[PDB]
Short mmCIF file of C-alpha atoms and ligand atoms in Angstrom, two decimals:
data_model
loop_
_atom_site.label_atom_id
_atom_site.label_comp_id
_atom_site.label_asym_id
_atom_site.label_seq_id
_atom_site.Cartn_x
_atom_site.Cartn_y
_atom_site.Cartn_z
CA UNK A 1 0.00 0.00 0.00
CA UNK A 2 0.89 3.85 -0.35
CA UNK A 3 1.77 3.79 3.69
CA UNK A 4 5.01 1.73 2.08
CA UNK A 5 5.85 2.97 -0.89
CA UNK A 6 8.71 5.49 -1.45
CA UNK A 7 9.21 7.38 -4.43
CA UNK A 8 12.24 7.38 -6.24
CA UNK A 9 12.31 8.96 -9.22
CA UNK A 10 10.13 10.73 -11.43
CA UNK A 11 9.09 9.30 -14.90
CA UNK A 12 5.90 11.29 -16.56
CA UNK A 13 2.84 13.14 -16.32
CA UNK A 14 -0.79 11.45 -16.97
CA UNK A 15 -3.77 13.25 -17.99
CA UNK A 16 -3.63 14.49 -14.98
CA UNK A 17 -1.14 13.98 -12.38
CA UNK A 18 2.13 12.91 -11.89
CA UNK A 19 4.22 9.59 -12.38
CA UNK A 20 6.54 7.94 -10.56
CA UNK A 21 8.77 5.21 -9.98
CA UNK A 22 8.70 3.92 -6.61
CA UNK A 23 9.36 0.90 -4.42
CA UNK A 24 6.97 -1.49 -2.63
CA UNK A 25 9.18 -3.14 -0.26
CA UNK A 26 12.05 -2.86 -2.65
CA UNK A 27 10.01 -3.69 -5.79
CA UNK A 28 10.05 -1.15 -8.24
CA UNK A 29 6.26 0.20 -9.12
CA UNK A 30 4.61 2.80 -10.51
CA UNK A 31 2.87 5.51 -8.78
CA UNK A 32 0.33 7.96 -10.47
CA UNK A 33 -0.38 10.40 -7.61
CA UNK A 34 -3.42 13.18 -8.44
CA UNK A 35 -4.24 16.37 -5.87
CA UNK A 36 -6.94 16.60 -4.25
CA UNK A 37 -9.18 18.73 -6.62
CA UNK A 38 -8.67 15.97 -9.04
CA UNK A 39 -10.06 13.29 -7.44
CA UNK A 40 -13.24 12.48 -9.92
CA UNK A 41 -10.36 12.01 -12.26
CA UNK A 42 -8.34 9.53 -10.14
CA UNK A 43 -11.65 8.13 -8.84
CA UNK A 44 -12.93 7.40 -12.23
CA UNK A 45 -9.64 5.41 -13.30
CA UNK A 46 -9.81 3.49 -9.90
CA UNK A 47 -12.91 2.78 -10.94
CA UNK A 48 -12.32 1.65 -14.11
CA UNK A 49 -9.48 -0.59 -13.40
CA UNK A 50 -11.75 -2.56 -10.32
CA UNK A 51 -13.71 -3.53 -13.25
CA UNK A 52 -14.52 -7.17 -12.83
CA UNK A 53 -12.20 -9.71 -14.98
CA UNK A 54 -10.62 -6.67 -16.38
CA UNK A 55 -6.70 -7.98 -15.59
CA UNK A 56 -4.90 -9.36 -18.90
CA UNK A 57 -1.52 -9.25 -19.71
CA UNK A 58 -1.72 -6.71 -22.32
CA UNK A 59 -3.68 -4.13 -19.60
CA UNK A 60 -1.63 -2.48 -17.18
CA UNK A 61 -1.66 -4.65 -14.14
CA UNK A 62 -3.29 -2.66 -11.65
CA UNK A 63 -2.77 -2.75 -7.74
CA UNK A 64 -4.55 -0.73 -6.14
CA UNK A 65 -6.14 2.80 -5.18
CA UNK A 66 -5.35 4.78 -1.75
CA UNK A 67 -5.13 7.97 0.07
CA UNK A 68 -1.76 9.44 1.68
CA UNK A 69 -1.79 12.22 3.99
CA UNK A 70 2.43 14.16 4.31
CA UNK A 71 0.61 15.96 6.93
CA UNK A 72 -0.76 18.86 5.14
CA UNK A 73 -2.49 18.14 2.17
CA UNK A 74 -3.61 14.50 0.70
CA UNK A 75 -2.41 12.77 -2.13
CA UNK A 76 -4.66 10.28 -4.04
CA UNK A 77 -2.57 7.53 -5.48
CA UNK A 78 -3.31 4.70 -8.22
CA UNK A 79 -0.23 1.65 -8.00
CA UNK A 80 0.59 -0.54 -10.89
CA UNK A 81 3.30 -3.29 -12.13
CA UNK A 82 6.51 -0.73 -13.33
CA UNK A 83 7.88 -1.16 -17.11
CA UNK A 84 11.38 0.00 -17.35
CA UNK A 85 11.22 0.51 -21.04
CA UNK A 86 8.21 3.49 -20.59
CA UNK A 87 5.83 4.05 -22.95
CA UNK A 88 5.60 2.67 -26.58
CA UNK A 89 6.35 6.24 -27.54
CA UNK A 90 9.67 6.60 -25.87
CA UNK A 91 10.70 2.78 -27.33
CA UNK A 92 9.85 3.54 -30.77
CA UNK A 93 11.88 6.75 -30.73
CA UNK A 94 14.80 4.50 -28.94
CA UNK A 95 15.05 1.64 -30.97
CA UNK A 96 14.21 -0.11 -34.32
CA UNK A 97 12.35 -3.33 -34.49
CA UNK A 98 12.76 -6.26 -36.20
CA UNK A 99 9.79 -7.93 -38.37
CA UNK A 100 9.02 -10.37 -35.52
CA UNK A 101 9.22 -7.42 -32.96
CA UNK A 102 6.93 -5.45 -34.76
CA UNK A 103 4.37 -8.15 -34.95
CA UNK A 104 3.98 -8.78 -30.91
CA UNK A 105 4.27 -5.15 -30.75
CA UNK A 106 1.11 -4.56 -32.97
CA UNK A 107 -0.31 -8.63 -31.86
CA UNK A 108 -0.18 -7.63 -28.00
CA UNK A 109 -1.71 -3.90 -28.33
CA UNK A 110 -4.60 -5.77 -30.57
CA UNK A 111 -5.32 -8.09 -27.95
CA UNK A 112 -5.14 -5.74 -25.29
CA UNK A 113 -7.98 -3.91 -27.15
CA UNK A 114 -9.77 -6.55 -28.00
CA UNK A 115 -9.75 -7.47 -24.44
CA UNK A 116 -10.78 -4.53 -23.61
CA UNK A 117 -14.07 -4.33 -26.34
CA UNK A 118 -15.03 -7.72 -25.47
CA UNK A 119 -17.73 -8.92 -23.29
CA UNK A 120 -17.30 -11.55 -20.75
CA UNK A 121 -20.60 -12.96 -20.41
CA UNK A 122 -21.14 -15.33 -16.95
CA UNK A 123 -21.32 -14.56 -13.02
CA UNK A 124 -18.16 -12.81 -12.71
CA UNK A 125 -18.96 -10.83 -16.23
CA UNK A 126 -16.64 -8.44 -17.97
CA UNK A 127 -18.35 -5.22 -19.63
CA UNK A 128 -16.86 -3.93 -23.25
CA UNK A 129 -14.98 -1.10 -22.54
CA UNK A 130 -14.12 1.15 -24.71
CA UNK A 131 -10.65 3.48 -24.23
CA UNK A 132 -11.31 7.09 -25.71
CA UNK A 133 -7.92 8.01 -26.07
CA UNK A 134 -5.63 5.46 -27.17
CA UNK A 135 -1.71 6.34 -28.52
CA UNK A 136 1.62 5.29 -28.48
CA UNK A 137 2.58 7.43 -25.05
CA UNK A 138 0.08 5.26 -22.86
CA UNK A 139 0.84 1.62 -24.43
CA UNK A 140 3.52 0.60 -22.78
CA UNK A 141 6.05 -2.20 -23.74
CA UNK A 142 7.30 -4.83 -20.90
CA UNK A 143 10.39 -6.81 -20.80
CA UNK A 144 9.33 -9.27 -22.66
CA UNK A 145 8.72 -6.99 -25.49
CA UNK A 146 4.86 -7.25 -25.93
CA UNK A 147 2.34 -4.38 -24.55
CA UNK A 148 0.22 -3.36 -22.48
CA UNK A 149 -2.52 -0.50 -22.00
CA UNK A 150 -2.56 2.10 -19.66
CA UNK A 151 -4.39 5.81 -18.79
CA UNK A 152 -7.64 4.18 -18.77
CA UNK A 153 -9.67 6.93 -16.97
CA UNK A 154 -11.62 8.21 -20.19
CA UNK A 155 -12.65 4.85 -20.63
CA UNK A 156 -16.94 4.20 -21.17
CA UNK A 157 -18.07 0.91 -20.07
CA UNK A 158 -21.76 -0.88 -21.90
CA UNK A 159 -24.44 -2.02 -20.43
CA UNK A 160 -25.18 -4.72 -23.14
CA UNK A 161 -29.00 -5.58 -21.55
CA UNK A 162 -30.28 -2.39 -22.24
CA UNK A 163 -27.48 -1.01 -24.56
CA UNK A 164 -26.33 2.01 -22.51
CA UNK A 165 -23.20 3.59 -21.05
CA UNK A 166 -21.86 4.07 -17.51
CA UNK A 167 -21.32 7.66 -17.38
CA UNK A 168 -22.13 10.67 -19.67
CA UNK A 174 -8.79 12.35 -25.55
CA UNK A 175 -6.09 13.59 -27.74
CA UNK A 176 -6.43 15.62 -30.60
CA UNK A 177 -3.80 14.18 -32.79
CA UNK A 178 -5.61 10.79 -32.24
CA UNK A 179 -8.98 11.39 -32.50
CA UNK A 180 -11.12 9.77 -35.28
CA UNK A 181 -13.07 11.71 -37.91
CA UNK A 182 -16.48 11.40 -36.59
CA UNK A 183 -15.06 12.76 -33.54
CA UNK A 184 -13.59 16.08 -34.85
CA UNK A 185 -16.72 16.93 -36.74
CA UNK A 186 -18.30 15.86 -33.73
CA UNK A 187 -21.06 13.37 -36.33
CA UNK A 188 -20.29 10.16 -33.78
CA UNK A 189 -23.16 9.13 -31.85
CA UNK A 190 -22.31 9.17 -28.12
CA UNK A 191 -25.04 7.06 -27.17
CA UNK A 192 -24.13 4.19 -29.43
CA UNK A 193 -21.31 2.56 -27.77
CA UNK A 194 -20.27 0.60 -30.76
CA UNK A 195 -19.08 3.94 -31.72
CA UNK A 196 -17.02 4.42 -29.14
CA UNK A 197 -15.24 0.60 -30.20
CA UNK A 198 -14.71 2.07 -33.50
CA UNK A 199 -13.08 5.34 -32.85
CA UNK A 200 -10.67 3.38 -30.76
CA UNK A 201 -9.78 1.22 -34.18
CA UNK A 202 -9.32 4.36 -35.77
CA UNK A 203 -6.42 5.60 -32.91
CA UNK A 204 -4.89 2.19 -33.08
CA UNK A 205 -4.34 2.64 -36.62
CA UNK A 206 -2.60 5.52 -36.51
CA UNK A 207 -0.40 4.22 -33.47
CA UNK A 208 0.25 0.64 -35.98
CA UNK A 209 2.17 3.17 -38.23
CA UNK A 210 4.48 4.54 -35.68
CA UNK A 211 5.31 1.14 -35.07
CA UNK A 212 6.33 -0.20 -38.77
CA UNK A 213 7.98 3.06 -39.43
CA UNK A 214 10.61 1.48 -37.17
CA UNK A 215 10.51 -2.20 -38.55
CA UNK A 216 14.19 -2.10 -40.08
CA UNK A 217 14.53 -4.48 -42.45
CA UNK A 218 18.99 -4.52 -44.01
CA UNK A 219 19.38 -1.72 -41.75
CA UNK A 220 16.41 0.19 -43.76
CA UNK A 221 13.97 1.81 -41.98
CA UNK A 222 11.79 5.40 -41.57
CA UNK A 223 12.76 7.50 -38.84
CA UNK A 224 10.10 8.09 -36.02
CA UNK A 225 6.81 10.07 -36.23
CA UNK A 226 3.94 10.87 -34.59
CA UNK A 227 1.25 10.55 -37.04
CA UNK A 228 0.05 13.75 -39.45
CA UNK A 229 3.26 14.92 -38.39
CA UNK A 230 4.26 17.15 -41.22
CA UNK A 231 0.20 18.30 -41.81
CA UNK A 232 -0.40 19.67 -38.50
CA UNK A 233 1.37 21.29 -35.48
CA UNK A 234 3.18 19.18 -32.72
CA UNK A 235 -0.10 20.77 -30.22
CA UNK A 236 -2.70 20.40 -32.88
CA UNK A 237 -6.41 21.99 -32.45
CA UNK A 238 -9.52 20.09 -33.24
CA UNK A 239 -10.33 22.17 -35.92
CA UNK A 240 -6.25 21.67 -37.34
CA UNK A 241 -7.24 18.41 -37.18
CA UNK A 242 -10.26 18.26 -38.80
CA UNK A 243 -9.04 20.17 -41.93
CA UNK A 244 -6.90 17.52 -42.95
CA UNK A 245 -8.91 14.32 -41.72
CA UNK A 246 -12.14 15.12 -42.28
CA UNK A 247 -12.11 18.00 -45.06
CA UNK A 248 -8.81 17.31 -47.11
CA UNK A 249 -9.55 13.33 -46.06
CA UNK A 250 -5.67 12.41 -46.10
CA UNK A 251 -3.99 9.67 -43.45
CA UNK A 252 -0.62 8.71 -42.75
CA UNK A 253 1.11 8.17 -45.72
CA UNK A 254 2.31 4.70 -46.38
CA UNK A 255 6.08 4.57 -47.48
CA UNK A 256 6.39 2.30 -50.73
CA UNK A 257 9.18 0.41 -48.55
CA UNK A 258 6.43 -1.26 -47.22
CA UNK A 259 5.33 -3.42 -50.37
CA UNK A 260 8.78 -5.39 -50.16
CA UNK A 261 8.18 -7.40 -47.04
CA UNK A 262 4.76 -9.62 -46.38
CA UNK A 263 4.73 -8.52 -42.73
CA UNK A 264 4.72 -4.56 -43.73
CA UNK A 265 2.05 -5.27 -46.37
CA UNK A 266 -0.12 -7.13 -43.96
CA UNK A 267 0.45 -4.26 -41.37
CA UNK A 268 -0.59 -1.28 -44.15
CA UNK A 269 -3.73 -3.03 -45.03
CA UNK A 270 -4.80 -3.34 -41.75
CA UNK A 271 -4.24 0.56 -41.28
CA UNK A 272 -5.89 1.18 -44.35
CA UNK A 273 -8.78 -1.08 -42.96
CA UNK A 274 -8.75 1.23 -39.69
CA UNK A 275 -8.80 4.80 -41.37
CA UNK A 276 -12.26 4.59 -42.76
CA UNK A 277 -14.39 7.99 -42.11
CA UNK A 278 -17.03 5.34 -41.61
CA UNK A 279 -16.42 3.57 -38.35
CA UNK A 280 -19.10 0.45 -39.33
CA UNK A 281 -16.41 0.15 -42.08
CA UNK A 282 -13.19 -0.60 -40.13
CA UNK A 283 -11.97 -3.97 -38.44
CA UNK A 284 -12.34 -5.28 -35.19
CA UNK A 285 -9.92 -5.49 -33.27
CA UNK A 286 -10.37 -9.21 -32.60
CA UNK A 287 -10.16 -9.55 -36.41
CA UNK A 288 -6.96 -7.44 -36.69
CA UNK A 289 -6.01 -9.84 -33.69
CA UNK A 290 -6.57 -12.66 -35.49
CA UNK A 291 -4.97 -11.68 -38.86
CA UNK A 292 -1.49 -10.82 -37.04
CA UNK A 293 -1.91 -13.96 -35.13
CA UNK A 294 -1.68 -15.75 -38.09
CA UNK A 295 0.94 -13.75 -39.95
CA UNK A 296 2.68 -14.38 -36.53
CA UNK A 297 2.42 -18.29 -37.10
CA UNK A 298 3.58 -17.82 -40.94
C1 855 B 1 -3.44 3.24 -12.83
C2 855 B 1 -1.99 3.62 -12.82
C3 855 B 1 -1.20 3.39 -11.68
C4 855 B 1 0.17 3.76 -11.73
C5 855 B 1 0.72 4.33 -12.90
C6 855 B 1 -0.14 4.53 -14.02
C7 855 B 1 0.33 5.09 -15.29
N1 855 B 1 1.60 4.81 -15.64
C8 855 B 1 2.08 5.27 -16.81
N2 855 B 1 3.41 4.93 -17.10
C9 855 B 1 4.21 3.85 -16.70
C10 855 B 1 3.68 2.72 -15.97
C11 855 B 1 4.55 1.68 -15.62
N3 855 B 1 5.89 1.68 -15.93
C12 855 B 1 6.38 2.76 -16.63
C13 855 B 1 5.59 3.85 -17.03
C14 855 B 1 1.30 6.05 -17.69
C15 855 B 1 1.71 6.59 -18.97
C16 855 B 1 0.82 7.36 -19.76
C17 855 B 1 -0.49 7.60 -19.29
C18 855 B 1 -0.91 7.08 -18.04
C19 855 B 1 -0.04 6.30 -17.23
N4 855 B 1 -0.52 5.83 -16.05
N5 855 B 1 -1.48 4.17 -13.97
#
């Protein structure tokens, strides 16, 4: 618990609050701490990761949710497992990966969402979720180089019996529907779909780095030379919804089966129409198999 836990070093800065590395009797974890104005925000992800059957191994594994008083103000805290590497941001901009690399990179953040989308039906039922604000700085890659989803505290949860949502993200991500503001909020299939969209975009940061003969694209966040690094909703909307253009797709990509697979799939995930793009258990099951290949 937080009573333990001393901070060591820190490593980011969420939505809201701050992150840190710290140790739980000499295990290294991480530490979002929020203030106490911000506690609907910290209460809401708490929330969200107590959600029954929600742990997987490509969701951040989540400990637990307490209060810590320094003897003047209180600090609300959310624990989780620690990655070294950081987010999928900060690896891609580190290193380049190999075509089997980029596969679990792209296999593990599919099943993480489709984990995440899907329904557990029984006693001890799981709710779709959907995320709301998916990228590459709140995947984050373990050890074992697979991912794993974080900041889930703009997540919406369904109510599948009556078809309904639990309560009432980033620009640069954000799908079309949701810049001209067209997506209907209460239809949470919507919701699933946008989150394709994001994913998407955050598949072609990753096979810009798939170096192939020591070949490969430098890194890029996507629409990075059509809009500023801080980009507006309407910036955005100019170019995805009005001009209707999408990463571009380097032609280095039609030499190796793995890239090809990967561009279709984004290709598959930029449609304006969100009833037009994959699932995500689909796209899990296509890299599954291109995985087996
Ligand atoms: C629920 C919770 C508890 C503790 C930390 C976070 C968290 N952590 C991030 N980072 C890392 C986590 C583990 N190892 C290294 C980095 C986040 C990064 C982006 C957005 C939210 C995050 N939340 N979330």
């Amino acid at each position: 618990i937080a009573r333990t836990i001393v901070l060591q070093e820190s490593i980011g800065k969420g939505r809201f609050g701050e992150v840190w590395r710290g140790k739980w009797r000499g295990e290294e974890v991480a530490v979002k701490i929020f203030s106490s104005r911000e506690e609907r925000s910290w209460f809401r992800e708490a929330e969200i990761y107590q959600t029954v059957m929600l742990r997987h191994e490509n969701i951040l594994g989540f400990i637990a949710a307490d209060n810590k008083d320094n003897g003047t103000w209180t600090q609300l805290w959310l624990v989780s497992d620690y990655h070294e590497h950081g987010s999928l941001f900060d690896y891609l901009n580190r290193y380049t990966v190999t075509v089997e690399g980029m596969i679990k990179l792209a296999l593990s953040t599919a099943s993480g969402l489709a984990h995440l989308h899907m329904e557990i039906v029984g006693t001890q039922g799981k709710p779709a979720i959907a995320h709301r604000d998916l990228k590459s700085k709140n995947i984050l890659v373990k050890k074992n180089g697979t991912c794993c989803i974080a900041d889930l505290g703009l997540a919406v949860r369904h109510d599948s019996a009556t078809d309904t949502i639990d309560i009432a993200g980033t620009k640069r991500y954000m799908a079309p529907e949701v810049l001209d503001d067209s997506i209907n909020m209460k239809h949470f299939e919507s919701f699933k779909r946008a989150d394709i969209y994001a994913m998407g975009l955050v598949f072609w940061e990753i096979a810009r780095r798939c170096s192939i003969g020591g070949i490969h694209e430098d890194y890029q966040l996507p629409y990075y030379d059509l809009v500023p690094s801080d980009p507006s909703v309407e910036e955005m909307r100019k170019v995805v919804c009005e001009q209707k253009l999408r990463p571009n797709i380097p032609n280095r990509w039609q030499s190796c089966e793995a890239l090809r697979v990967m561009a279709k799939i984004m290709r598959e995930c930029w449609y304006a129409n969100g009833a037009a793009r994959l699932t995500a258990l689909r796209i899990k099951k296509t890299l599954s198999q291109l995985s087996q290949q």
